[PDB]
Amino acid sequence: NVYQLKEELIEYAKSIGVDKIGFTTADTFDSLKDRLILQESLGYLSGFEEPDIEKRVTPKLLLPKAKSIVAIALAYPSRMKDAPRSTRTERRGIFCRASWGKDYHDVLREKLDLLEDFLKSKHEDIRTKSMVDTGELSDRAVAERAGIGFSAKNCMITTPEYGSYVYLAEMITNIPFEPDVPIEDMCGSCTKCLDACPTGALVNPGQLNAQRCISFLTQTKGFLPDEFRTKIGNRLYGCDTCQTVCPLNKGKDFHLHPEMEPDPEIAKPLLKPLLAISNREFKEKFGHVSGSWRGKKPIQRNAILALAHFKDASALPELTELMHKDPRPVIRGTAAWAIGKIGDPAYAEELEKALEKEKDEEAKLEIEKGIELLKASGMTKQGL
Ligand code: B12
Numbered sequence: 001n002v003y004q005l006k007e008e009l010i011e012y013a014k015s016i017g018v019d020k021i022g023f024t025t026a027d028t029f030d031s032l033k034d035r036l037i038l039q040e041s042l043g044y045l046s047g048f049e050e051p052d053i054e055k056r057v058t059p060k061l062l063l064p065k066a067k068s069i070v071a072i073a074l075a076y077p078s079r080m081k082d083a084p085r086s087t088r089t090e091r092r093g094i095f096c097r098a099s100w101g102k103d104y105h106d107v108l109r110e111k112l113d114l115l116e117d118f119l120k121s122k123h124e125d126i127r128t129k130s131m132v133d134t135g136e137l138s139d140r141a142v143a144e145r146a147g148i149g150f151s152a153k154n155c156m157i158t159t160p161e162y163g164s165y166v167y168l169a170e171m172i173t174n175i176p177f178e179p180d181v182p183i184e185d186m187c188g189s190c191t192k193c194l195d196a197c198p199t200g201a202l203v204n205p206g207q208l209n210a211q212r213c214i215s216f217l218t219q220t221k222g223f224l225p226d227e228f229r230t231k232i233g234n235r236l237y238g239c240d241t242c243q244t245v246c247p248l249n250k251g252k253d254f255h256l257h258p259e260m261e262p263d264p265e266i267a268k269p270l271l272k273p274l275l276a277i278s279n280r281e282f283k284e285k286f287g288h289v290s291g292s293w294r295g296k297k298p299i300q301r302n303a304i305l306a307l308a309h310f311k312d313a314s315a316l317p318e319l320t321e322l323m324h325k326d327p328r329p330v331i332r333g334t335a336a337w338a339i340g341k342i343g344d345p346a347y348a349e350e351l352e353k354a355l356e357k358e359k360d361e362e363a364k365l366e367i368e369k370g371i372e373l374l375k376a377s378g379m380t381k382q383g384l
Protein backbone atom coordinates (compact mmCIF):
# COMPACT_ATOMS: atom_id res chain seq x y z
CA ASN A 1 0.00 0.00 0.00
CA VAL A 2 2.47 2.64 1.18
CA TYR A 3 5.16 0.26 -0.05
CA GLN A 4 3.42 -0.08 -3.42
CA LEU A 5 2.99 3.69 -3.67
CA LYS A 6 6.67 4.18 -2.86
CA GLU A 7 7.73 1.77 -5.60
CA GLU A 8 5.38 3.41 -8.10
CA LEU A 9 6.69 6.86 -7.14
CA ILE A 10 10.31 5.76 -7.66
CA GLU A 11 9.53 4.30 -11.08
CA TYR A 12 7.65 7.43 -12.11
CA ALA A 13 10.40 9.73 -10.85
CA LYS A 14 12.98 7.83 -12.88
CA SER A 15 10.87 8.00 -16.03
CA ILE A 16 10.63 11.82 -15.87
CA GLY A 17 14.38 12.22 -15.43
CA VAL A 18 15.00 12.19 -11.69
CA ASP A 19 18.49 10.74 -11.35
CA LYS A 20 18.31 9.77 -7.70
CA ILE A 21 15.39 9.65 -5.29
CA GLY A 22 15.38 9.02 -1.54
CA PHE A 23 13.07 8.97 1.47
CA THR A 24 13.38 10.25 5.02
CA THR A 25 10.99 10.91 7.91
CA ALA A 26 9.61 14.36 8.72
CA ASP A 27 11.35 14.32 12.11
CA THR A 28 13.23 17.37 13.34
CA PHE A 29 16.83 17.91 12.27
CA ASP A 30 18.35 18.18 15.75
CA SER A 31 21.97 17.94 14.64
CA LEU A 32 21.40 20.63 12.01
CA LYS A 33 19.86 22.95 14.60
CA ASP A 34 23.00 22.93 16.76
CA ARG A 35 25.18 23.36 13.68
CA LEU A 36 23.21 26.34 12.36
CA ILE A 37 23.41 28.11 15.73
CA LEU A 38 27.17 27.48 15.94
CA GLN A 39 27.81 28.66 12.37
CA GLU A 40 25.76 31.76 13.16
CA SER A 41 27.75 32.35 16.35
CA LEU A 42 31.00 32.16 14.39
CA GLY A 43 29.78 34.55 11.68
CA TYR A 44 30.18 31.81 9.08
CA LEU A 45 26.75 31.90 7.43
CA SER A 46 26.08 33.73 4.16
CA GLY A 47 22.73 35.42 4.74
CA PHE A 48 21.13 33.45 1.89
CA GLU A 49 19.74 30.94 4.42
CA GLU A 50 16.19 31.06 5.72
CA PRO A 51 16.53 33.17 8.88
CA ASP A 52 14.08 31.28 11.13
CA ILE A 53 16.03 28.30 12.50
CA GLU A 54 12.96 26.55 13.93
CA LYS A 55 11.44 26.52 10.43
CA ARG A 56 14.66 25.17 8.92
CA VAL A 57 14.84 22.13 11.17
CA THR A 58 11.16 21.29 11.67
CA PRO A 59 9.38 19.80 8.61
CA LYS A 60 6.14 19.47 10.58
CA LEU A 61 6.07 23.26 10.99
CA LEU A 62 6.21 23.67 7.22
CA LEU A 63 3.55 21.07 6.51
CA PRO A 64 1.20 20.21 9.39
CA LYS A 65 1.03 16.49 10.21
CA ALA A 66 3.92 15.71 7.85
CA LYS A 67 5.16 12.12 7.84
CA SER A 68 8.01 12.05 5.29
CA ILE A 69 10.23 13.96 2.88
CA VAL A 70 10.91 12.79 -0.65
CA ALA A 71 14.38 13.92 -1.76
CA ILE A 72 15.45 14.18 -5.40
CA ALA A 73 18.69 14.86 -7.25
CA LEU A 74 19.45 15.56 -10.91
CA ALA A 75 23.01 15.33 -12.24
CA TYR A 76 24.31 18.29 -14.19
CA PRO A 77 27.11 18.48 -16.79
CA SER A 78 30.62 19.21 -15.56
CA ARG A 79 32.25 19.67 -18.96
CA MET A 80 31.39 22.32 -21.52
CA LYS A 81 31.28 21.09 -25.12
CA ASP A 82 33.11 23.33 -27.60
CA ALA A 83 34.31 25.72 -24.91
CA PRO A 84 35.74 28.88 -26.52
CA ARG A 85 39.32 29.72 -25.59
CA SER A 86 39.95 32.87 -23.59
CA THR A 87 42.78 34.75 -25.34
CA ARG A 88 44.86 37.89 -24.75
CA THR A 89 42.76 39.99 -27.14
CA GLU A 90 39.47 38.28 -26.24
CA ARG A 91 39.36 37.53 -22.52
CA ARG A 92 36.43 35.57 -21.12
CA GLY A 93 34.93 35.06 -17.67
CA ILE A 94 33.27 31.89 -16.39
CA PHE A 95 29.98 30.93 -14.75
CA CYS A 96 29.99 27.97 -12.36
CA ARG A 97 28.54 24.64 -13.50
CA ALA A 98 25.43 25.18 -11.36
CA SER A 99 24.61 28.15 -13.60
CA TRP A 100 24.87 26.33 -16.94
CA GLY A 101 21.72 26.06 -19.05
CA LYS A 102 18.21 26.56 -17.68
CA ASP A 103 17.92 27.68 -14.04
CA TYR A 104 17.79 24.53 -11.88
CA HIS A 105 15.12 26.20 -9.72
CA ASP A 106 12.73 25.94 -12.66
CA VAL A 107 13.76 22.46 -13.78
CA LEU A 108 13.56 20.77 -10.40
CA ARG A 109 10.30 22.53 -9.47
CA GLU A 110 8.83 21.27 -12.75
CA LYS A 111 9.73 17.73 -11.68
CA LEU A 112 8.35 18.17 -8.15
CA ASP A 113 5.09 19.44 -9.65
CA LEU A 114 4.81 16.23 -11.64
CA LEU A 115 5.52 14.07 -8.57
CA GLU A 116 2.93 16.03 -6.59
CA ASP A 117 0.29 15.55 -9.27
CA PHE A 118 1.15 11.85 -9.37
CA LEU A 119 0.39 11.63 -5.64
CA LYS A 120 -2.73 13.84 -5.73
CA SER A 121 -4.10 11.87 -8.69
CA LYS A 122 -4.50 8.90 -6.36
CA HIS A 123 -7.24 10.96 -4.67
CA GLU A 124 -6.28 9.92 -1.14
CA ASP A 125 -6.14 13.24 0.75
CA ILE A 126 -2.38 13.44 0.22
CA ARG A 127 -0.82 16.82 1.03
CA THR A 128 2.58 18.07 -0.11
CA LYS A 129 4.99 21.00 0.17
CA SER A 130 7.85 21.30 -2.30
CA MET A 131 11.03 23.35 -2.42
CA VAL A 132 14.32 23.76 -4.25
CA ASP A 133 17.03 25.97 -2.70
CA THR A 134 14.70 28.85 -1.76
CA GLY A 135 12.69 26.96 0.83
CA GLU A 136 13.20 26.77 4.58
CA LEU A 137 14.85 23.33 4.83
CA SER A 138 18.50 22.52 4.37
CA ASP A 139 18.36 20.64 1.05
CA ARG A 140 21.67 18.94 1.92
CA ALA A 141 20.44 17.87 5.39
CA VAL A 142 17.42 16.29 3.75
CA ALA A 143 19.53 14.61 1.04
CA GLU A 144 21.93 13.15 3.61
CA ARG A 145 19.17 11.73 5.80
CA ALA A 146 17.43 10.33 2.72
CA GLY A 147 20.52 8.50 1.45
CA ILE A 148 21.02 10.60 -1.69
CA GLY A 149 24.69 11.19 -0.92
CA PHE A 150 27.10 11.70 1.96
CA SER A 151 28.29 15.00 3.45
CA ALA A 152 31.84 15.47 2.21
CA LYS A 153 34.71 17.58 3.53
CA ASN A 154 34.03 20.28 0.91
CA CYS A 155 30.47 20.46 2.34
CA MET A 156 29.00 18.92 -0.83
CA ILE A 157 26.40 16.19 -0.83
CA THR A 158 28.34 13.65 -2.90
CA THR A 159 26.75 10.70 -4.69
CA PRO A 160 28.53 7.50 -5.74
CA GLU A 161 27.33 7.54 -9.38
CA TYR A 162 27.20 11.27 -10.13
CA GLY A 163 29.68 12.74 -7.67
CA SER A 164 28.85 16.13 -6.18
CA TYR A 165 27.59 17.51 -9.50
CA VAL A 166 23.89 17.23 -8.63
CA TYR A 167 21.05 19.68 -7.97
CA LEU A 168 18.94 18.89 -4.90
CA ALA A 169 15.25 19.35 -4.08
CA GLU A 170 12.62 17.84 -1.82
CA MET A 171 8.92 17.39 -1.22
CA ILE A 172 7.44 17.06 2.26
CA THR A 173 4.37 14.81 2.42
CA ASN A 174 1.83 13.37 4.87
CA ILE A 175 2.64 9.84 3.67
CA PRO A 176 4.43 7.53 6.13
CA PHE A 177 6.95 6.21 3.58
CA GLU A 178 9.57 3.89 5.06
CA PRO A 179 12.77 5.96 5.25
CA ASP A 180 16.05 5.04 3.55
CA VAL A 181 19.49 4.61 5.14
CA PRO A 182 22.28 7.23 5.02
CA ILE A 183 25.29 6.15 2.95
CA GLU A 184 28.99 5.80 3.79
CA ASP A 185 31.46 8.70 3.96
CA MET A 186 34.03 8.18 1.21
CA CYS A 187 36.48 11.01 1.89
CA GLY A 188 38.87 9.08 4.13
CA SER A 189 42.06 11.01 4.89
CA CYS A 190 41.86 13.15 1.74
CA THR A 191 42.18 16.95 2.15
CA LYS A 192 42.47 18.04 -1.49
CA CYS A 193 39.48 20.40 -1.44
CA LEU A 194 40.59 22.12 1.77
CA ASP A 195 44.10 22.54 0.38
CA ALA A 196 42.91 23.88 -2.98
CA CYS A 197 40.37 26.45 -1.76
CA PRO A 198 41.79 29.81 -2.89
CA THR A 199 40.63 31.69 0.24
CA GLY A 200 40.76 28.97 2.88
CA ALA A 201 36.99 29.31 3.30
CA LEU A 202 36.86 25.60 4.12
CA VAL A 203 38.12 26.26 7.66
CA ASN A 204 37.59 22.67 8.85
CA PRO A 205 36.34 19.47 7.20
CA GLY A 206 32.71 20.14 6.26
CA GLN A 207 32.80 23.66 7.70
CA LEU A 208 32.48 26.70 5.46
CA ASN A 209 33.15 30.28 6.41
CA ALA A 210 30.73 31.51 3.76
CA GLN A 211 31.91 35.11 4.15
CA ARG A 212 35.27 34.06 2.65
CA CYS A 213 33.87 31.72 -0.02
CA ILE A 214 34.35 32.96 -3.60
CA SER A 215 30.93 31.57 -4.52
CA PHE A 216 29.28 33.84 -1.96
CA LEU A 217 31.58 36.77 -2.78
CA THR A 218 30.73 36.72 -6.51
CA GLN A 219 27.08 37.31 -5.55
CA THR A 220 27.48 40.33 -3.29
CA LYS A 221 26.09 43.68 -4.46
CA GLY A 222 28.55 46.05 -2.77
CA PHE A 223 32.30 46.56 -3.17
CA LEU A 224 34.38 43.39 -3.01
CA PRO A 225 36.91 43.50 -0.14
CA ASP A 226 40.40 44.10 -1.56
CA GLU A 227 41.84 40.82 -0.24
CA PHE A 228 39.54 38.85 -2.58
CA ARG A 229 40.07 40.99 -5.69
CA THR A 230 43.19 39.01 -6.60
CA LYS A 231 41.62 35.64 -5.76
CA ILE A 232 38.42 35.81 -7.80
CA GLY A 233 40.36 35.24 -11.04
CA ASN A 234 37.99 35.30 -13.99
CA ARG A 235 35.00 33.96 -12.09
CA LEU A 236 31.79 35.86 -12.83
CA TYR A 237 29.44 33.77 -10.73
CA GLY A 238 30.08 30.91 -8.33
CA CYS A 239 33.19 28.79 -7.80
CA ASP A 240 33.76 25.09 -8.63
CA THR A 241 37.31 24.56 -7.37
CA CYS A 242 36.54 22.37 -4.32
CA GLN A 243 34.54 20.11 -6.65
CA THR A 244 36.86 19.93 -9.65
CA VAL A 245 39.85 18.90 -7.51
CA CYS A 246 37.78 16.13 -5.89
CA PRO A 247 38.76 12.53 -6.77
CA LEU A 248 35.13 11.46 -6.27
CA ASN A 249 34.19 13.66 -9.24
CA LYS A 250 36.79 12.17 -11.59
CA GLY A 251 35.11 11.10 -14.81
CA LYS A 252 31.74 12.37 -13.61
CA ASP A 253 30.35 14.34 -16.54
CA PHE A 254 26.66 13.62 -17.07
CA HIS A 255 24.59 15.04 -19.91
CA LEU A 256 21.16 13.62 -19.16
CA HIS A 257 19.03 16.77 -19.34
CA PRO A 258 19.21 18.73 -22.63
CA GLU A 259 18.08 22.07 -21.11
CA MET A 260 21.07 22.02 -18.73
CA GLU A 261 23.63 22.16 -21.55
CA PRO A 262 25.69 25.34 -21.26
CA ASP A 263 25.55 27.93 -24.01
CA PRO A 264 29.26 28.80 -24.19
CA GLU A 265 28.63 32.40 -25.27
CA ILE A 266 26.92 33.19 -21.97
CA ALA A 267 28.46 30.49 -19.77
CA LYS A 268 31.98 31.57 -20.70
CA PRO A 269 31.24 35.10 -21.96
CA LEU A 270 33.53 37.74 -23.42
CA LEU A 271 34.30 40.24 -20.64
CA LYS A 272 34.39 43.54 -22.55
CA PRO A 273 30.85 43.33 -23.97
CA LEU A 274 29.60 42.73 -20.41
CA LEU A 275 30.90 46.17 -19.43
CA ALA A 276 28.34 47.84 -21.69
CA ILE A 277 25.39 45.46 -21.67
CA SER A 278 21.90 46.95 -21.52
CA ASN A 279 19.25 45.76 -19.08
CA ARG A 280 17.20 44.48 -22.02
CA GLU A 281 20.11 42.53 -23.49
CA PHE A 282 21.07 41.10 -20.10
CA LYS A 283 17.54 39.86 -19.50
CA GLU A 284 17.36 38.36 -22.99
CA LYS A 285 20.75 36.62 -22.88
CA PHE A 286 21.22 35.73 -19.20
CA GLY A 287 17.71 35.89 -17.78
CA HIS A 288 17.10 32.15 -17.75
CA VAL A 289 20.28 31.00 -15.97
CA SER A 290 20.53 30.70 -12.18
CA GLY A 291 23.47 33.12 -12.10
CA SER A 292 21.24 36.02 -13.14
CA TRP A 293 19.19 36.03 -9.92
CA ARG A 294 20.95 39.06 -8.43
CA GLY A 295 20.77 41.05 -11.65
CA LYS A 296 23.67 42.27 -13.77
CA LYS A 297 25.56 44.47 -11.31
CA PRO A 298 27.61 41.82 -9.50
CA ILE A 299 28.40 40.14 -12.83
CA GLN A 300 29.64 43.46 -14.27
CA ARG A 301 31.66 44.21 -11.13
CA ASN A 302 33.24 40.77 -11.44
CA ALA A 303 33.88 41.32 -15.16
CA ILE A 304 35.82 44.46 -14.25
CA LEU A 305 37.87 42.57 -11.65
CA ALA A 306 38.59 39.82 -14.19
CA LEU A 307 39.91 42.34 -16.72
CA ALA A 308 42.15 43.75 -13.97
CA HIS A 309 43.26 40.19 -13.24
CA PHE A 310 44.25 39.77 -16.91
CA LYS A 311 45.78 43.27 -16.92
CA ASP A 312 43.86 43.89 -20.15
CA ALA A 313 45.11 47.29 -21.34
CA SER A 314 42.63 47.28 -24.25
CA ALA A 315 39.79 47.62 -21.71
CA LEU A 316 41.23 50.84 -20.25
CA PRO A 317 39.18 53.27 -22.39
CA GLU A 318 35.90 51.51 -21.55
CA LEU A 319 36.80 51.30 -17.85
CA THR A 320 37.56 55.02 -17.96
CA GLU A 321 34.14 55.72 -19.49
CA LEU A 322 32.51 53.55 -16.81
CA MET A 323 34.43 55.33 -14.05
CA HIS A 324 32.88 58.63 -15.21
CA LYS A 325 29.47 57.64 -16.58
CA ASP A 326 28.02 54.62 -14.78
CA PRO A 327 25.21 55.59 -12.39
CA ARG A 328 26.28 52.90 -9.89
CA PRO A 329 29.08 53.82 -7.40
CA VAL A 330 30.18 50.16 -7.13
CA ILE A 331 30.80 50.10 -10.89
CA ARG A 332 32.48 53.53 -11.06
CA GLY A 333 34.73 52.69 -8.14
CA THR A 334 35.65 49.17 -9.16
CA ALA A 335 36.47 50.46 -12.65
CA ALA A 336 38.77 53.09 -11.13
CA TRP A 337 40.52 50.45 -9.03
CA ALA A 338 40.92 48.21 -12.08
CA ILE A 339 42.48 51.07 -14.07
CA GLY A 340 45.07 51.34 -11.30
CA LYS A 341 45.60 47.58 -11.04
CA ILE A 342 46.12 47.15 -14.81
CA GLY A 343 49.15 49.39 -14.36
CA ASP A 344 49.35 51.70 -17.39
CA PRO A 345 50.75 55.01 -16.12
CA ALA A 346 49.14 56.88 -19.04
CA TYR A 347 45.88 56.76 -17.07
CA ALA A 348 47.22 58.12 -13.77
CA GLU A 349 46.35 61.72 -14.62
CA GLU A 350 42.76 60.87 -15.54
CA LEU A 351 42.40 59.07 -12.21
CA GLU A 352 43.61 62.24 -10.48
CA LYS A 353 41.09 64.28 -12.45
CA ALA A 354 38.23 61.85 -11.76
CA LEU A 355 39.03 62.07 -8.04
CA GLU A 356 38.12 65.76 -7.99
CA LYS A 357 34.78 65.27 -9.76
CA GLU A 358 33.45 62.15 -8.01
CA LYS A 359 30.95 62.97 -5.24
CA ASP A 360 30.31 59.47 -3.82
CA GLU A 361 32.69 58.91 -0.91
CA GLU A 362 33.12 55.16 -1.49
CA ALA A 363 33.78 55.63 -5.21
CA LYS A 364 36.21 58.41 -4.27
CA LEU A 365 38.03 55.95 -2.04
CA GLU A 366 38.33 53.45 -4.89
CA ILE A 367 39.86 56.13 -7.14
CA GLU A 368 42.36 56.85 -4.35
CA LYS A 369 43.16 53.13 -4.21
CA GLY A 370 43.68 53.01 -7.97
CA ILE A 371 46.00 56.01 -7.86
CA GLU A 372 47.97 54.29 -5.08
CA LEU A 373 48.28 51.07 -7.10
CA LEU A 374 49.77 53.01 -10.03
CA LYS A 375 52.15 54.88 -7.72
CA ALA A 376 53.29 51.63 -6.13
CA SER A 377 53.88 49.83 -9.44
CA GLY A 378 55.62 52.93 -10.80
CA MET A 379 57.99 52.89 -7.83
CA THR A 380 58.61 49.15 -8.17
CA LYS A 381 59.59 49.56 -11.83
CA GLN A 382 62.12 52.21 -10.73
CA GLY A 383 63.46 50.12 -7.85
CA LEU A 384 62.33 52.72 -5.32
C1 B12 B 1 23.44 29.51 1.62
C2 B12 B 1 23.87 28.66 0.46
C3 B12 B 1 25.14 28.77 -0.03
C4 B12 B 1 26.21 29.63 0.66
C5 B12 B 1 26.83 28.81 1.81
C6 B12 B 1 27.11 27.33 1.49
C7 B12 B 1 27.37 26.46 2.70
N1 B12 B 1 28.33 25.55 2.57
O1 B12 B 1 26.69 26.57 3.73
C8 B12 B 1 27.16 29.94 -0.54
C9 B12 B 1 26.68 31.21 -1.25
C10 B12 B 1 28.64 30.11 -0.15
C11 B12 B 1 26.89 28.73 -1.41
C12 B12 B 1 27.85 28.17 -2.24
C13 B12 B 1 27.60 27.04 -3.04
N2 B12 B 1 26.47 26.34 -3.17
CO1 B12 B 1 24.90 26.76 -2.14
N3 B12 B 1 23.32 26.89 -1.11
C14 B12 B 1 22.96 27.57 -0.05
C15 B12 B 1 21.62 27.15 0.55
C16 B12 B 1 20.55 28.19 0.15
C17 B12 B 1 21.57 26.90 2.08
C18 B12 B 1 22.85 26.22 2.59
C19 B12 B 1 22.87 26.22 4.10
O2 B12 B 1 21.83 26.28 4.75
N4 B12 B 1 24.07 26.12 4.66
C20 B12 B 1 24.28 26.05 6.10
C21 B12 B 1 25.17 24.83 6.48
C22 B12 B 1 25.64 24.96 7.91
O3 B12 B 1 24.37 23.67 6.39
P1 B12 B 1 24.05 22.81 5.06
O4 B12 B 1 25.33 22.85 4.24
O5 B12 B 1 22.81 23.16 4.33
O6 B12 B 1 23.96 21.34 5.71
C23 B12 B 1 25.05 20.54 6.11
C24 B12 B 1 25.78 21.01 7.37
O7 B12 B 1 24.80 21.44 8.31
C25 B12 B 1 26.44 19.70 7.82
N5 B12 B 1 26.49 19.54 9.27
C26 B12 B 1 25.46 19.26 10.14
N6 B12 B 1 25.86 18.93 11.34
C27 B12 B 1 27.25 18.97 11.27
C28 B12 B 1 28.22 18.69 12.23
C29 B12 B 1 29.57 18.78 11.92
C30 B12 B 1 30.60 18.43 12.97
C31 B12 B 1 29.97 19.17 10.61
C32 B12 B 1 31.42 19.29 10.25
C33 B12 B 1 29.00 19.45 9.65
C34 B12 B 1 27.66 19.35 9.99
O8 B12 B 1 25.67 18.64 7.28
C35 B12 B 1 24.56 19.17 6.53
C36 B12 B 1 24.18 18.21 5.42
O9 B12 B 1 25.25 18.03 4.50
C37 B12 B 1 21.42 25.79 -0.15
C38 B12 B 1 19.96 25.43 -0.47
C39 B12 B 1 19.20 25.03 0.79
N7 B12 B 1 18.05 25.65 1.00
O10 B12 B 1 19.67 24.20 1.56
C40 B12 B 1 22.29 25.86 -1.42
C41 B12 B 1 23.12 24.61 -1.86
C42 B12 B 1 23.81 24.08 -0.61
N8 B12 B 1 24.13 25.16 -2.74
C43 B12 B 1 24.44 24.37 -3.71
C44 B12 B 1 25.52 24.66 -4.65
C45 B12 B 1 25.41 23.87 -5.93
C46 B12 B 1 26.54 25.52 -4.29
C47 B12 B 1 27.87 25.77 -5.01
C48 B12 B 1 28.58 24.49 -5.48
C49 B12 B 1 27.60 26.78 -6.16
C50 B12 B 1 28.90 27.16 -6.86
N9 B12 B 1 29.33 26.36 -7.83
O11 B12 B 1 29.50 28.19 -6.53
C51 B12 B 1 28.70 26.44 -3.88
C52 B12 B 1 29.43 25.39 -3.01
C53 B12 B 1 30.19 25.96 -1.81
C54 B12 B 1 30.46 24.91 -0.75
N10 B12 B 1 31.64 24.32 -0.80
O12 B12 B 1 29.60 24.61 0.09
C55 B12 B 1 23.62 23.10 -3.70
C56 B12 B 1 24.52 21.95 -3.20
C57 B12 B 1 24.14 20.57 -3.75
C58 B12 B 1 25.04 19.46 -3.27
N11 B12 B 1 25.17 18.43 -4.09
O13 B12 B 1 25.61 19.52 -2.18
C59 B12 B 1 22.43 23.50 -2.76
C60 B12 B 1 21.82 22.34 -1.95
C61 B12 B 1 21.33 24.10 -3.66
C62 B12 B 1 20.49 23.05 -4.45
N12 B12 B 1 19.25 22.82 -4.06
O14 B12 B 1 21.01 22.49 -5.42
N13 B12 B 1 25.65 28.26 -1.22
Ligand code: SF4
Binds near residue numbers: 196200202212238241
Ligand atom coordinates in the same frame (compact mmCIF):
# COMPACT_ATOMS: atom_id res chain seq x y z
S1 SF4 C 1 33.41 27.27 -3.76
FE1 SF4 C 1 35.56 27.99 -4.12
S2 SF4 C 1 35.93 29.52 -2.46
FE2 SF4 C 1 34.06 28.35 -1.86
S3 SF4 C 1 34.83 26.66 -0.55
FE3 SF4 C 1 34.77 25.82 -2.67
S4 SF4 C 1 36.86 26.22 -3.50
FE4 SF4 C 1 36.65 27.52 -1.64
Ligand code: SF4
Binds near residue numbers: 193
Ligand atom coordinates in the same frame (compact mmCIF):
# COMPACT_ATOMS: atom_id res chain seq x y z
S1 SF4 D 1 38.60 16.49 -2.36
FE1 SF4 D 1 38.96 14.71 -0.97
S2 SF4 D 1 38.33 15.46 1.09
FE2 SF4 D 1 37.48 16.94 -0.42
S3 SF4 D 1 35.38 16.19 -0.81
FE3 SF4 D 1 36.70 15.23 -2.40
S4 SF4 D 1 37.32 13.22 -1.53
FE4 SF4 D 1 36.49 14.48 0.19
Ligand SMILES: [Cl-]
Binds near residue numbers: 124
Ligand atom coordinates in the same frame (compact mmCIF):
# COMPACT_ATOMS: atom_id res chain seq x y z
CL1 LIG E 1 -1.22 6.95 1.28
